[PDB]
């Protein structure tokens, strides 16, 4: 069957469940880079 | 006079499509075409994501 199936905004906000978990997760490491440089500083 | 009267009413199509499908249990027209699988699908290379 030549289907025409498509996705909804539970899926496209599920895409945002990934990306926001990435841009926040790289933001915390920049704290961890800092908060262990003033541990050594 | 009665057989032609059922055809112009279109009753015979309902009389046809009843017993060829309700005795079926199988899906008719499941294959159709192959244009939707022209490219690589996900599952054909989803093991690389795995």
UniProtKB/Swiss-Prot annotation, chain A:
Gene: Cacng3
Protein's name in the database: Voltage-dependent calcium channel gamma-3 subunit
Family (UniProt): Belongs to the PMP-22/EMP/MP20 family. CACNG subfamily.
Organism: Rattus norvegicus
Assembly, per entry: The L-type calcium channel is composed of five subunits: alpha-1, alpha-2/delta, beta and gamma. Acts as an auxiliary subunit for AMPA-selective glutamate receptors (AMPARs). Found in a complex with GRIA1, GRIA2, GRIA3, GRIA4, CNIH2, CNIH3, CACNG2, CACNG4, CACNG5, CACNG7 and CACNG8. Interacts with AP4M1 and GRIA1; associates GRIA1 with the adaptor protein complex 4 (AP-4) to target GRIA1 to the somatodendritic compartment of neurons.
TM region positions: 13-29
Free-text function comment from the UniProt entry: Regulates the trafficking to the somatodendritic compartment and gating properties of AMPA-selective glutamate receptors (AMPARs). Promotes their targeting to the cell membrane and synapses and modulates their gating properties by slowing their rates of activation, deactivation and desensitization. Does not show subunit-specific AMPA receptor regulation and regulates all AMPAR subunits. Thought to stabilize the calcium channel in an inactivated (closed) state.
Section covered of the full-length record: 170 to 207 of 315
Cell location: Membrane
From Swiss-Prot, chain B:
Sites marked Interaction with the cone snail toxin Con-ikot-ikot: 5
Inducing stimuli: Down-regulated in the pyramidal cell layer of CA1 in the hippocampus by global ischemia.
Subcellular location: Cell membrane; Postsynaptic cell membrane; Postsynaptic density membrane
Tissue note: Detected in forebrain. Detected in dendrites of neuronal cells. Expressed in the pyramidal cell layers of CA1 and CA3 and in the granule cell layer of the dentate gyrus.
PTM text: Palmitoylated. Depalmitoylated upon L-glutamate stimulation.
Subunit structure: Homotetramer or heterotetramer of pore-forming glutamate receptor subunits. Tetramers may be formed by the dimerization of dimers. May interact with MPP4. Forms a ternary complex with GRIP1 and CSPG4. Interacts with ATAD1 in an ATP-dependent manner. ATAD1-catalyzed ATP hydrolysis disrupts binding to ATAD1 and to GRIP1 and leads to AMPAR complex disassembly. Interacts with GRIP2. Interacts with GRIP1. Interacts with NSF via its C-terminus. Interacts with CACNG2, PICK1 and GRIP2. Interacts with GRIA1 and SYNDIG1. Part of a complex containing GRIA2, NSF and NAPA and/or NAPB.
Protein family according to the UniProt entry: Belongs to the glutamate-gated ion channel (TC 1.A.10.1) family. GRIA2 subfamily.
Miscellaneous notes: The postsynaptic actions of L-glutamate are mediated by a variety of receptors that are named according to their selective agonists. This receptor binds AMPA (quisqualate) > L-glutamate > kainate.
Note on domains (UniProt): The M4 transmembrane segment mediates tetramerization and is required for cell surface expression.
Function: Ionotropic glutamate receptor that functions as a ligand-gated cation channel, gated by L-glutamate and glutamatergic agonists such as alpha-amino-3-hydroxy-5-methyl-4-isoxazolepropionic acid (AMPA), quisqualic acid, and kainic acid. L-glutamate acts as an excitatory neurotransmitter at many synapses in the central nervous system and plays an important role in fast excitatory synaptic transmission.
UniProt protein name: Glutamate receptor 2
Lineage, broadest ranks: Eukaryota, Metazoa, Chordata, Craniata, Vertebrata
The encoding gene: Gria2
């Amino acid at each position: 069957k030549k289907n025409s199936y498509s996705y909804g905004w539970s899926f496209y906000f599920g895409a945002l469940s990934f990306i926001i978990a990435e841009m926040v997760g790289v933001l915390a490491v920049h704290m961890f880079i800092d908060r262990h440089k003033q541990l050594t500083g | 006079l009665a057989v032609l009267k059922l055809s112009e009413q279109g009753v015979l199509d309902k009389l046809k499509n009843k017993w060829w499908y309700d005795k079926g249990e199988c899906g008719a027209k499941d294959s159709g075409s192959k244009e939707k699988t022209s490219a690589l699908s996900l599952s054909n290379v989803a093991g690389v994501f795995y």
